[PDB]
Each structure stands twice: as C-alpha cells, then as structure tokens.
C-alpha cells in the first residue's frame, strides 16, 4: 500500500576519488533510517569506484545514458554498461540535460523505455521554468513532460518521478511545502486517469530544488511528497539528516 | 621537424569489461611501430579500468568533457576528473557530438581552452556534412570550425586536428588518398597563414572516416596525412595493422 520513502543524491559534476571516498565512508557509517531507500548518482567516470566502495544497501545511479545498447555515439554510455559495473539506477531528463544540453521530451521518453527494458530503475525528472510558472502554465508543462515518458513506459514498478522546478535548482529558493504538495497531487491525479489507479498509488513522486536539512522535515510530511532528489546538500553530511527526514 | 605518426582509436559507445579487457591484452602484447603515438578513447564509465590495464606507452582519451572543473552539470565530466584517473587526452568536437547532440563551434572552442589549461592533450575534430560538400562549401565549413578551435588555443604542442568528413563516418566509404590529401593540404595551409609557420609544420592532422586495414597503407603515405582517428576498426585486432600503417 504505502510507497517507500525515497531519497536520491545527485552529486552532479563534483568530486575526485579522494573527496568522494571520504563522503562514502561517512554514509557507510551513518545511522540511516531502515525504511528509506537511498540512491547516489555519481559521475560516469567514478561509477565503478562508487559502486565498489558503497555499501550494497545504498543504490548507485548513473547521471544520464543513451537509448540503444551500443553504436557510433561518441561520449555516451548505455544501460548495458551501467549494469556491467553493477549499478541499478539511472537519472534521466534532469533539468540540466533538458535545458543546458537541449534533450527533448521525446528523446527522454525514449531513453527511459530503454533503461527499463534493460532492467534499470529510472528517476525520471520533470519541471517547469520560471517564465512558465509566472505565466500560470506549470501543469500544462509537467503534464506534457510526463506524457512523453508514459507513452514509452511498459511497466512503472521501477520508475520514480522527480518534480524539480528548474528555477529552484541552485538558488536557495525552494517551493513552500504547500506549493510542492500542489504539483505532486496534480501529478498523481494525472497518472490515475491516464495510466491506472495502481500506478498512482504505488509510484514515488519525489521533490527536488534546494532541499536542505533545514527545510526537509516540513516537505516530507506532505501527503504526496514521497522523498527528495538532493543536489548540493548530497555532498555534505547534512545529506544524512535529509534521509532521516521522517522523524 | 617531421611529426610523429599518430593513431587514435575511438571505441565510441561499445564494450564491456570482458571484451575491452581482451582487446587491451591484445594491444599490450602486440608488436607496435615504435615511432607511432597510439591513444585509445574509452567510454567514460571504463576510463579508470582502461588506464589501469593498458600499458603506459599507450595513451588513454576521454570521448568528451565539459568546459569547467566542477558545477551543476548533471551527466558531464571535467578534465579535472580525467586527470584524476591518470588519462592525458580528450576527444573534442567529434561529428557525433556536433550533429547528433547539437554542440556548437563556440562550445567546442570553450571546451578546448579548458582542457588545454588543465594540461590535457586534445584531439579536436572538424568536418563537413554531405550537403555542404555538394554545395561547394567544404573549405568554408572546415576553416570556420578550425578558427573556433584556434581562437582558444594558447599552445598547439598538445593539439591534434582530426579531419572527418561526416558522410565518411560509418558509410563504408572513405575519401580517395588524393581527396584526403587535398583537405589536409588546405588545412595545413590555413594554419600557416592564420597562426604561424612553426605550428603548421609541427601540428598533426589525422584522417578519420572509414579507415580499415585495407586502405590505411595508401592513406598514410600521403604527405600531409599524419595518422588516423579510427572508428569501428579500433575494436578489432586489425587496429594493430593500422597503427603499423607506415610499412
């Protein structure tokens, strides 16, 4: 019935072996809540290293991948390769991929279908820009994004949706608890009526966008917030407090 | 005065630990020409592994990187990370980054300057699409692309130009030796007049695009072809015969 609290940490393009090694040693020794599912998204060049050093109770995610297993696609990695080093998750459609590197809704729908067909879990991110929110069209944009994903997903049991306002990323200005509830509620209600009631009840919709130890307890006690995608705070020991947001 | 013959192997999005390990062991025990500088571009996920297993005589290259050392750029790696695992090269501006993934000449230029600043060698790729060749503007396009690179190079000693006609990539169709010579001659001429004489004569300009064991001997014996960027043949043992193309 209940969805398991899910907290992913997106290290983005930070770290070396020495500094990620210290961060991992800290997580491996932290008191983590037993009912929380934790995943860390390491840069591709350190995925093998992260997976070796991290305790098996903690998931490892690639920060992107491509939509075929192999081929002439210089600079890309496939799910085949992610599985090969032993990782089980992939973050797809992150705001920075969509908006800095120009990945379309349809390309992400495609990447997700493949990731799933190869047996990866997927954290599919969606979110509106500031001009889109000031205009009132937040729902139209996130629905459009989710719809490109849904048309490609055969099975949702291994998918987590991450709602991440593009303008909340890296700014200290997060959504108020009430603003975030508003979008997940609507998003869950989209899944209900466009996929099924079961997929709505059982799919985790997590919030990202300036999540910190300061603001997470309030966010987590919202009915339709199922966890967090954490950026900058994932590189610091306050990441532990966020994993334990529910007490 | 002459330039070392140079052969880069671009594995692109291919391989796993087992099959790349076999390939690396083949190279490690191969008879290679001593006056050939070899470099292997591995997928980012296998860079660490590749650098550890490959003999130190053989260089290792990333297939791409971003333009700053760290930051909120999900899915990207920096030269600081490439250096951290001991690799010394990066491939930048590949046809596939340019045309599949939308990277502009200005972004590639910024990438080049940052990689050079952090102490990496660079294989910068330039080349025209088929519509551009039949329109008569091959030279316009490659000079435009070369200029975006040169405007961001302080020190040319660590740079290798790879000319790849995009219509030659994966079409089983290479330029004739005369056609390839014609472009490298033009390119070296361009460097002569827009940079310096010394740079023109010391800078390696390698040919990429449908290079096999069958055609490399004839290509390499042209006066301004200084080596190759090999695509699909870099995964076969005939990669060894291309490294040895000069006899």
Catalytic-role residue among A37, A96, A128, A164: A164
- Using a CB-CB cut-off of 8 Å, the residues of chain A touching B63 are 74-75
Q: Among B13, B82, B208, B209, which would you mutate to test the A interface (most chain A Cβ atoms within 10 Å of its Cβ)? A: B13
What is the distance in angstroms between the Cα of B23 and the nearest Cα belonging to chain A? 16
Q: Among B21, B72, B74, which would you mutate to test the A interface (most chain A Cβ atoms within 10 Å of its Cβ)? A: B74
Instruction: Tell me if A17 sits within 8 A of B84, measured CB to CB.
Output: yes
Nearest CA in chain A to B169: A72
The answer to whether the Cβ–Cβ distance between A12 and B170 falls below 8 Å is no
Burial of B57 (0-12, 13-18, 19+ CB in 10 A): exposed
Q: Count contacts between A and B (CB, < 8 Å).
A: 128
Q: Using alpha carbons, select from A79, A56, A84, A60 the residue that is nearest to residue A69.
A: A79
Residue keyed to tokens 């390696």: B204
Instruction: Tell me if B231 sits within 8 A of B208, measured CB to CB.
Output: yes
What is the distance in angstroms between the Cα of A1 and the nearest Cα belonging to chain B? 33
Chain B residues whose C-beta is within 8 A of a chain A C-beta are: 10, 12-17, 41, 43-49, 62-64, 66, 70-78, 80-82, 84-85, 91, 94-97, 100-102, 169-170, 231-232
* Beta carbons within 10 angstroms of residue A143's beta carbon: 16
| Token code pair at residue A193 | 């009526």
What DSSP string describes B138-207? HHHHHHHHHHHHHTT-S-GGGEEEEE--GGGTTSS----HHHHHHHHHHHHHHHHHHT-HHHHHHSEEEE
> Nearest 5°: CA angle at B230, between B227 and B233?
130
Sign of CA dihedral A68, A69, A75, A77: positive
CATH of the domain at B200: 3.20.20.70
Instruction: Tell me if A1 sits within 8 A of A201, measured CB to CB.
Output: yes
Which of B13, B47, B73 has its CB closest to that of A78?
B13
Sign of CA dihedral A8, A98, B145, B137: positive
Per the structure, the complete domain to which residue B152 belongs is given by: 1-247
Cα gap B144→B132, rounded to integer Å: 13
Cα gap A114→A158, rounded to integer Å: 12
| Token code pair at residue B187 | 């390119």
Q: Among A61, A73, A74, A110, which would you mutate to test the B interface (most chain B Cβ atoms within 10 Å of its Cβ)? A: A74
Residue A171 region by backbone torsions, left for phi larger than 0, else alpha for psi between -120 and 50, else beta: alpha
What is the distance in angstroms between the Cα of B57 and the nearest Cα belonging to chain A? 22
Give me the half-sphere count of Cα atoms (radius 13 Å) on the Cβ side of residue B193.
6
Report the number of distinct structural domains present in chain A.
Answer: 1
Measured CA distances, B37 to A35, B57, B112, B123, B244 (Å): 54, 8, 21, 13, 11
Binding-site residues of B for substrate, please? 10, 12
> Nearest 5°: CA angle at B10, between B8 and B16?
130
Question: Does A70 appear as a known binding residue?
Answer: no
Instruction: Tell me if B118 sits within 8 A of B110, measured CB to CB.
Output: no
The answer to whether the Cβ–Cβ distance between B45 and A43 falls below 8 Å is no
Nearest CA in chain A to B230: A72
The answer to whether the Cβ–Cβ distance between A91 and B85 falls below 8 Å is no
Active site residue A194: no
Sign of CA dihedral B75, B50, B43, A57: negative
What is the distance in angstroms between the Cα of B95 and the nearest Cα belonging to chain A? 9
- Using a CB-CB cut-off of 8 Å, the residues of chain A touching B232 are 72
Q: Using alpha carbons, select from A202, A185, A191 the residue that is nearest to residue A3.
A: A202
Cα gap B198→B217, rounded to integer Å: 27
Question: Which letter, b or e, does each residue of B143-181 get, where b requires 16 or more Cβ atoms within 10 Å of its Cβ?
Answer: bebbebbbebbeebeebbbbbbbbbbbbeeebbebeebb
Task: Indicate which residues of B carry an active-site annotation.
Answer: 94, 164
Q: Using alpha carbons, select from A122, A77, A112, A82 the residue that is nearest to residue A229.
A: A122
Cα gap A162→B137, rounded to integer Å: 46
Active site residue A94: yes
Cα gap B88→B231, rounded to integer Å: 20
The answer to whether the Cβ–Cβ distance between A64 and B84 falls below 8 Å is no
* Beta carbons within 10 angstroms of residue A29's beta carbon: 10
Cα gap B119→A11, rounded to integer Å: 24
Q: Which experimental technique did the depositors report for determining this structure?
A: X-ray
| Token code pair at residue B47 | 């860079």
Catalytic-role residue among A94, A96, A114, A128: A94
């Amino acid at each position: 019935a209940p969805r398991k609290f899910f907290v992913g940490g997106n290290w983005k393009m930070n770290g070396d072996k020495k500094s990620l090694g210290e961060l991992i040693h800290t997580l491996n020794g932290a008191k983590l809540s037993a009912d929380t599912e934790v995943v860390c998204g390491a840069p591709s060049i350190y995925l093998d290293f992260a997976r070796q050093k991290l305790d098996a109770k903690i998931g490892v995610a690639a920060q992107n991948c491509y939509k075929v297993p192999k081929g002439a696609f210089t600079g890309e990695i496939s799910p085949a390769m992610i599985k090969d080093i032993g990782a089980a998750w992939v973050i797809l459609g992150h705001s920075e991929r969509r908006h800095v590197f120009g990945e379309s809704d349809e390309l992400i729908g495609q990447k997700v279908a493949h990731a799933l067909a190869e047996g990866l879990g997927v954290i599919a991110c969606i979110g509106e820009k500031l001009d889109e929110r000031e205009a009132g069209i937040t729902e139209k944009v996130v629905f459009e994004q989710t719809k490109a994903i849904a048309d490609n997903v055969k099975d949702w049991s291994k998918v987590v949706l991450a709602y991440e306002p593009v303008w909340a990323i890296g700014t200290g200005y997060s959504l108020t608890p009430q603003q975030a509830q508003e979008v997940h509620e609507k998003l869950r209600g989209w899944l209900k009526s466009h996929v099924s009631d079961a997929v709505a009840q059982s799919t985790r919709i997590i919030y990202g966008g300036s999540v910190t130890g300061g603001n997470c307890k309030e966010l987590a006690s919202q009915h339709d917030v199922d966890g967090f995608l954490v950026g900058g705070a994932s590189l610091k020991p306050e990441f532990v407090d966020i994993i334990n947001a529910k007490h």
